[PDB]
Amino acid sequence: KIEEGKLVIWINGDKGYNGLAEVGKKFEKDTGIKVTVEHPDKLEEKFPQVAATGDGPDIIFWAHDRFGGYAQSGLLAEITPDKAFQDKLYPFTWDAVRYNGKLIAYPIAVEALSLIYNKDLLPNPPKTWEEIPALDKELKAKGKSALMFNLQEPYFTWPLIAADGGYAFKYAAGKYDIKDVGVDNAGAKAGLTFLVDLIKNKHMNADTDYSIAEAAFNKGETAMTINGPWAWSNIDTSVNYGVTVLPTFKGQPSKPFVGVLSAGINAASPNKELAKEFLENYLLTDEGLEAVNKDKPLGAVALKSYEEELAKDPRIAATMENAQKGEIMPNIPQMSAFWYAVRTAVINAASGRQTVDAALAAAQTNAAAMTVGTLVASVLPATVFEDLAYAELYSDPPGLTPLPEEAPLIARSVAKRRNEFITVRHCARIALDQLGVPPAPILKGDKGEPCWPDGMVGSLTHCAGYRGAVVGRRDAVRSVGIDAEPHDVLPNGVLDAISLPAERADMPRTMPAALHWDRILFCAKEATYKAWFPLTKRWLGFEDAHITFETDSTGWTGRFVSRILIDGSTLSGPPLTTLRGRWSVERGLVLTAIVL
Amino acid sequence: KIEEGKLVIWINGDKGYNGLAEVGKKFEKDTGIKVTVEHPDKLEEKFPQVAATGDGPDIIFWAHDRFGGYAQSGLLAEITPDKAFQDKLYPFTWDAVRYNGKLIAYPIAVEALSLIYNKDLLPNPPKTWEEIPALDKELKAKGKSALMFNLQEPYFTWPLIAADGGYAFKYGKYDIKDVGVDNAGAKAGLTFLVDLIKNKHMNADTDYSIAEAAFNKGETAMTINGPWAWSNIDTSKVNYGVTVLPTFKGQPSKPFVGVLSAGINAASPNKELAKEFLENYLLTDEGLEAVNKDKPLGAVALKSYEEELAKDPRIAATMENAQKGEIMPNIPQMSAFWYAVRTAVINAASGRQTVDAALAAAQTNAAAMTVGTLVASVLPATVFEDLAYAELYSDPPGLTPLPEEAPLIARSVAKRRNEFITVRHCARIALDQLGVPPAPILKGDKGEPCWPDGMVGSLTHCAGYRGAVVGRRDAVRSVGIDAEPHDVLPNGVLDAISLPAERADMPRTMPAALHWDRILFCAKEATYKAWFPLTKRWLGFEDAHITFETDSTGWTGRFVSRILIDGSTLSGPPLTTLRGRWSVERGLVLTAIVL
C-alpha cells in the first residue's frame, strides 16, 4: 500500500535530506501534494525487501551502482525524459543510469572520494600512501594520528585496492564480463596488504568506522580523513581543511569508484507522474539543487547550468580530479555481490580473521554469487523491515566454502548435503551483514536448530532450486521460521500424515484451483515448527497445529494462522497459542515465513 | 571368557615383560600351566574396560595408585597371603595395596624417578633446576641440550610441580575437597617448566621415546626416568649416573612414588594358579632377578632380594628421591587427578592455556572421577585396543564447554547445558585414552555428533548418567550407545516402539526383575545411532526387529537388531543385522552396538 496523491522519498542519512524536504515543501505549496522524506539505515538493502511486497517509497535515491539489481527484479519504472530535459544534464550521467537499453533513474550528482586534511596540523599533505607510516609516527609523538577513515565500508578502501591494478569486473566493448573479477590479482593484494600493515603497525584501528573517523577529524585529533562532498558541511561547522588528490600507491593514482547519485521511481508507485514532475521540474533545477547542496554538498551536479557555478569551488575541482583518476562504477546486478565480497574481505583481513590472500581468494568467488532475488521478501512483513534481512540463491555457486568452524558439520556428509549447507550459510552471512553483523559460523544445536550470533535470530531453508536465509534482530523479533518447497503435489500418503481432516476440507475451498494446496500446507507446517522450537524446545507434530489460510486478491500470495493444539508455553515470554505467517507461490516454489 | 588352566598377565611395555615371561616359562615347566605375558598400550585404562565384561588378564600389573579405582568397581579379588608370606615383604608395601582394610594386590617394587645424566657430557650434574637454562646454553653451543624428558605424562613433571608446595589431595585421611594443583607452589613449578619451553631449552612435543632416544644417543646430557629405563642405557654407549633430582626454589623435587603391584582379576577362574605364580615364582629372589635383569624393578618389596639391590648406588638414588617425594594415594579419585594434571601440563606447555587457566581447570577437573564401568560392560573386549570410554553419574561443578562448543547451548535450558557439557567432558577423557588431543564435539546431520578425523563414537545422557564411547575408525565402523532409566515405559509408548513379535518373545527371554519394555526401547535408540552415520537415513522403531538373550548372571546379555528396510550405506556393506549388548545396574539400562 503506497498511498496515492502523496510522495515518499528515501535518501541516505549522510546526504542533504532536510534540503530535499525544503524542495518537497515547495512542491506541496504549488501542487497540494505532500512530500515526506525519510532516511532509513541500509536503505540500499531495504528498498528491494519492501518494494518486493509492492511497498516502499515512491522515489529512492542512491548511487547508480545499485540500480541494475533493482531493475532486474522489476522494481523500477522506466524513465523517459524528453529531448530538451536530457540536454540539460551531462551525457555521461545519463549513461550511468542506463541499463539494458532503458533509463532507470534520473542522475543527480557525481560523487568521488578525496583526501581531506587539517592544514594547521599538516600544511603539506602526503603525496604517497607509503609515507603515511612515517607521518603517523611523527603525529603520534604530538598526541595525534595521521589518518582515520571508515574501514567498515569497502567504498573507502577500494581506491587503494584499485590503485596498482585491482578491478571489479572486466569491461570490454561496452560490456562487463562477470566471469573476470579483479579482486584477487597482484595489484589488489598489494593494496590490501598495505592497509593491513597499517593496522598491524598501529597506524589505524580495524574498528574505525564512519562516525569515529568523522568525529576524530572534526575535533582535530587526526590530520587526515577520506570522504566525499557530503562530509564538508560538518567540517565547515567545526578546522582549517583542504580537499585534495588522494595519495598514490606504487606511484599510481588511487582510483576511487565514482557514483552518480540517482533517483529511481518505484515500479509499484501510483504516483509516477507526480514523481517525474517533482524530479524534473522541482529538484533538477538550480533552485532545487541549491536547496539540497546547501544542506550537504552534492558534489559535481548533473545539471549543466548549476555545475557551471559549482565547478568554481576548488573542493569540486579536487573531487573531479580524483573522479577522473578513478572509474565510474558498473550498474550491473552483480554489484551488490561484488560489494559484499569486498566488504567481507576487507573486514576479515583487517581483523586477522583471514590472511589477505585467503580473504581475496574468497572475494573473487563470492563476487560471482549474486543475490538480488526477492521470493522470500514477498512473505516478510514490510513493517518490520529495519530489523529483518534476507538473501537467497537458486543454485549452488561454484567454489563456495564453509567457514573453518563449520566444516566439521559436513565432513562426512553427502555431496548434495554439503552444497545446500554451504550455500544457505553464505546466504545467512549476506543477511547478517545487512544487519551490521560480521561473518560468523552458523552451527547446529538442540534438535538441529541453527545457532545465531548474539542478538540475532533467523531461519534457513534449502530445497530443489532454492536456498534462503532470513535473519532478525532479537531485541525486536522473538523468532523467525521460513520454509521453501517445490510447488509440486505431495508424494502419496504424505497429505494424510501431515494434515487434519478440517484442513483437507477447508483448503481446497479457500485456495485457487491452480495451487497445490497440499504442498502449501506442508510448507507452512514446517515453517511453524522452525519458528516454534527455539522458543519452546519442544516437539510440535503435524497434527498439533491447525492451519487456516486466506488468499490475497492476486491469487498467488496470502496469510495463514497456525493454531497450536498442544501446550503452547514458551520458556520465557508469551505462549505460542497461535502463530501468524504469510505464503507465496512464485517461480515454481512455495515460500512461507513467520516472524514472531 | 577367561580361559581356565592358563594364565594371562598384563604389564606395561616399559617394564621387564620378557623377564616376566621367563618366570612364566619356568612355571609352565613345573606345572604344565601356560603363561602368556602381554603389554597392551594404555593397559591402566584397558584393564577396567575389559574386566567389566568378565574378561581380561588373570593378573594385572600397575603402580598401586590405580588399584583403588579398580577395587571400587569390583574388578579385583581380595588376596589371601598367610602371615609367613607377609613377613617376607616390607610392611609399607602392603600399606600401598590395602584398600578399605582389604589387601587387593601383591606389592612388587618401589619406583621413583631420578635424574639420569651422561658422565662424559656432564660430570657434575646441577643441584638446582634454576641452573638448567644456563647449562643448556652452554651445551647448545656444542650441538647438544641439557635435558629431555617425557612432557606428555604428568608423572614426569609432578616432581617439579610439587617441589615448592603443589599437592594432589591434602592428607588421618585424604581430603578430596582440598586439591593442591592450583596453589602458588604448583603454579611456580609449572611456570618454570613453560618458561624452559618458551626459551627453547625444551620442546613441548617431547615424549618418552623421543627423550629416551636422545639421551641414549648422547644428544642430551640429562633425562628424568625410573629404574626400568636403566637397561636400555646399559646397552647404549652412554656412561650414565643416577642421582637426586634438582631442587626448585631451594626445596627438593618430590616425585610421586609408585609401588608396582600385581592384582588378580575378580573374574579369573584361575585365582589359585595366580596366587601360586605370584607367591612361589615371582616373589622370590630368582623370580625378581629374572625380571630385574630385563628392566630394573627399583627397590623390591621382597626383603631378601632388596638386601642385595640396596648396595647399588642407582637404587640408593632411587630411594633418596622416593623418600623426598611421597607414596601415591590409592583412592579412586587418582585417575581424575592424573587426567586433570595431564591436560593442564600439555595445555600450558603447548600454549593452549596459560599456566593459571590450566591449573584452575585442573582443580575443577580433579573432582570429576570416572571409574564406573557400566557402559564398559556392554563393549566388546575383542576390540579393546581401539575403543575407549568414560561415564559420570552427576554433573561435576564448574565444568565448561570448549569455546567452539559454547554456541550449541547458548540459549539452551540448564538441564540441557549440563548434560551437553558433562557428556563432552566424558568424550574428551575417552579421546585422551586413544591419544587424541581435546577437540570440540559439534552436532551435524540430524544432530549426529561430529568426531575428530579417524574417530567414531556415541554419546548418551539421561537422569543419573552421562557416557561417551569413542573408537578408531580404521577398526570400528560405527558406535551407538544409549542409556535410559530403568523404569516402565509411559502409557502407549510400548506399542509405538515395538513389533508384535517383540512383545511376544521378549518377556520369555528376560528375568522378572527387568523392565523389558524399557530395555527394548533403549536398544532401538542405540540401533539408530549406530545406523545413522553410515546411512544418513531415518530408521523407525518399526524398522528393526530386535531379539534378546540374557547371560546366566541375569543383569546383562546380548541382542540382535535386524534391519527390516533397505540397508544401503554411504560406503561398505549394507547394514543387515547389528549385534549389541545390554546391561542393567544402579537403576539404569545401558546398550551398545560396535560395528
Ligand SMILES: CC(C)(COP(=O)(O)OP(=O)(O)OC[C@H]1O[C@@H](n2cnc3c(N)ncnc32)[C@H](O)[C@@H]1OP(=O)(O)O)[C@@H](O)C(=O)NCCC(=O)NCCS
Ligand atoms: C526440521 C524440518 C522442519 C526442516 O524442514 P524442511 O522443509 O525439511 O527442510 P528445510 O531445508 O526447509 O529446513 C532445514 C533447516 O531447518 C533448520 N532446523 C532444523 N532443525 C530445527 C529446529 N529444531 N528448530 C529450528 N530450525 C531447525 C536448519 O537450519 C536446517 O538447515 P541446516 O541443517 O542446513 O542448518 C523438517 O525436517 C522436520 O523435521 N519437520 C518435523 C517437525 C514439523 O515440521 N512439525 C510440524 C509442526 S506444525
Ligand SMILES: CC(C)(COP(=O)(O)OP(=O)(O)OC[C@H]1O[C@@H](n2cnc3c(N)ncnc32)[C@H](O)[C@@H]1OP(=O)(O)O)[C@@H](O)C(=O)NCCC(=O)NCCS
Ligand atoms: C536421537 C535419539 C536416538 C537419541 O536418543 P535418546 O535415548 O533419546 O537420547 P540420548 O541422550 O541417549 O542420546 C542423545 C545423543 O545422541 C546423539 N545423536 C543425536 N542425533 C543423532 C544421529 N542422527 N545419529 C547419531 N547420533 C545422534 C547425540 O550425540 C546426542 O547428544 P548431544 O545432543 O548431547 O550431542 C532419539 O532421540 C531419537 O530421536 N530417536 C528416533 C530414532 C530411533 O530411535 N529409531 C529407532 C531405530 S530401531
Ligand SMILES: OC[C@H]1O[C@H](O[C@H]2[C@H](O)[C@@H](O)[C@@H](O)O[C@@H]2CO)[C@H](O)[C@@H](O)[C@@H]1O
Ligand atoms: O561500501 C560499499 C558501498 O559503496 C557505495 O556506497 C557509497 C555511496 O555511493 C555514497 O553515496 C556514500 O553514501 O557512501 C557509500 C559508502 O558507505 C556504493 O554505492 C554502495 O552500493 C556500496 O555498498
Ligand SMILES: OC[C@H]1O[C@H](O[C@H]2[C@H](O)[C@@H](O)[C@@H](O)O[C@@H]2CO)[C@H](O)[C@@H](O)[C@@H]1O
Ligand atoms: O603420568 C600419569 C601416570 O603416572 C603414573 O604412571 C607411571 C607408572 O607409575 C610407572 O610405572 C611408569 O610406567 O610410568 C607411568 C607414567 O607414564 C601413575 O601410576 C598412573 O596412574 C598415571 O596415569
Ligand SMILES: [Mg+2]
Ligand atoms: Mg522445505
Ligand SMILES: [Mg+2]
Ligand atoms: Mg536414552
